[PDB]
From Swiss-Prot, chains A, B:
The lineage of its organism: Eukaryota, Metazoa, Chordata, Craniata, Vertebrata. This is Gamma-aminobutyric acid receptor-associated protein. Belongs to the ATG8 family. Its main location: membrane. Ubiquitin-like modifier that plays a role in intracellular transport of GABA(A) receptors and its interaction with the cytoskeleton. Involved in autophagy: while LC3s are involved in elongation of the phagophore membrane, the GABARAP/GATE-16 subfamily is essential for a later stage in autophagosome maturation. Through its interaction with the reticulophagy receptor TEX264, participates in the remodeling of subdomains of the endoplasmic reticulum into autophagosomes upon nutrient stress, which then fuse with lysosomes for endoplasmic reticulum turnover. Pfam families: ATG8. GO terms for molecular function: beta-tubulin binding; GABA receptor binding; microtubule binding; phosphatidylethanolamine binding; ubiquitin protein ligase binding. InterPro entries: Atg8-like (IPR004241), Ubiquitin-like_domsf (IPR029071). A lipid is attached at G134 (Phosphatidylethanolamine amidated glycine). Residues 19-40 are annotated as: Interaction with beta-tubulin. One of its GO terms (cellular component) is intracellular membrane-bounded organelle. Residues 66-68 are annotated as: Interaction with LIR (LC3 nteracting Region) motif of ATG3. Residues 54-134 are annotated as: Interaction with GPHN. The gene is GABARAP.
């Protein structure tokens, strides 16, 4: 409601410790929100995901950071598809982080997007060789 | 199924960074699980909550750690009632952390317990004067 009070709640301060994103640094919020809003409108069966390396990760690079992922793929299948894009062995460690936390491997990409997408309509994922974002 | 393979999942490694608890260090898991199962059976309308101070918190002490909380109380109301037990002013900073994260102030204690109780059936909350757990 335009004339209703907006509650400011302590948990918003979690954003003080959000994961680093060069993507966010290079692109202003309004352009990001524009593109993610347009792409969610255009591929509603898919979610847009920015996949970036964690600051101290010792792990092979990824060419593209922007992915349109079917919303019914699990996180585990996404591990496989990113691993295949990085060209990692099955044994090479690969960890995802959403809001600094390893997401459930059973979870769907659509459920992660619904719960953790940002106000620019993008889901941000960091990847590392280690199990702690750092 | 006992004869079925148990999935070992990457997100379990989140527990490597679990918040400190003097309670868990002083009481072995099996005694805690016994008490949390018995107390969940006796009080189905309530959730058992362990409230302990964060390692770096500069904040008044709590005489008791063990609380039986009605599961329909909000996080905001639980803030108020813990505030009343510490005897803090309204304007004195007080933050809760569940699994290192500030919970939603609108969430119910029962929901928080459902998503975040540990295998001893206790919900663990740390409190601090600062907005980041440390």
């Amino acid at each position: 409601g335009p004339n209703d009070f907006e509650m400011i709640d302590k948990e918003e301060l979690e954003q003080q410790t959000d994961m680093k994103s060069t993507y966010k640094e290079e692109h202003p919020f309004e352009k990001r929100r524009s593109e993610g809003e347009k792409i969610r409108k255009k591929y509603p069966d898919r979610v847009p995901v920015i996949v970036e390396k964690a600051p101290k990760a010792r792990i092979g690079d990824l060419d593209k950071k922007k992915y349109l992922v079917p919303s019914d793929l699990t996180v585990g299948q996404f591990y496989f598809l990113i691993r295949k894009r990085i060209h990692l062995r099955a044994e090479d460690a690969l960890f995802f982080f959403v809001n600094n936390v390893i997401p459930p491997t059973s979870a769907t990409m659509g459920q992660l997007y619904q719960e953790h997408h940002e106000e620019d309509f993008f889901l941000y994922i960091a990847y590392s060789d280690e199990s702690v974002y750092g």
